[PDB]
Amino acid sequence: SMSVKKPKRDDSKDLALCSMILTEMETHEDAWPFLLPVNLKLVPGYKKVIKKPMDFSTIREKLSSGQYPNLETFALDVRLVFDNCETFNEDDSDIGRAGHNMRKYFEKKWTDTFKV
Numbered sequence: 001s002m003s004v005k006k007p008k009r010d011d012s013k014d015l016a017l018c019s020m021i022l023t024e025m026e027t028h029e030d031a032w033p034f035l036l037p038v039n040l041k042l043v044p045g046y047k048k049v050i051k052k053p054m055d056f057s058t059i060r061e062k063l064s065s066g067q068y069p070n071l072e073t074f075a076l077d078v079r080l081v082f083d084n085c086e087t088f089n090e091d092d093s094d095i096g097r098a099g100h101n102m103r104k105y106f107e108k109k110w111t112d113t114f115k116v
């Protein structure tokens, strides 16, 4: 609280590390459904159903332009990609399974990088 400071983790490397993680995501062979925004005029229903679209290129743009206040907000957007995917795609569809794979891939890198 006021004048009662918690020790807080060193965050100086967070931008670099998130960029590294995002690069690994981008180059994953199953990244293809998520590299660019869902084409709202190619994919019937997407605009109405998915309230907050997100994709890797948008995350990359926000990361490169200082639009994430902290690593938690970065993780929010990454997870949003896979949450959207799970909302819209069947689990065993190519895109659906890609989403599950990419989520697992992200969460391990996340834990390995930041959680001691």
Ligand SMILES: Cc1ncccc1N[C@@H]1CCCS(=O)(=O)C1
Residues within 6 Å of the ligand: 032, 033, 034, 037, 038, 039, 042, 043, 085, 088, 089, 095
């Ligand atoms: C992640 C996702 N969620 C719902 C529908 C489709 C997709 N991926 C598509 C893959 C390439 C072209 S696209 O059709 O615009 C987007």
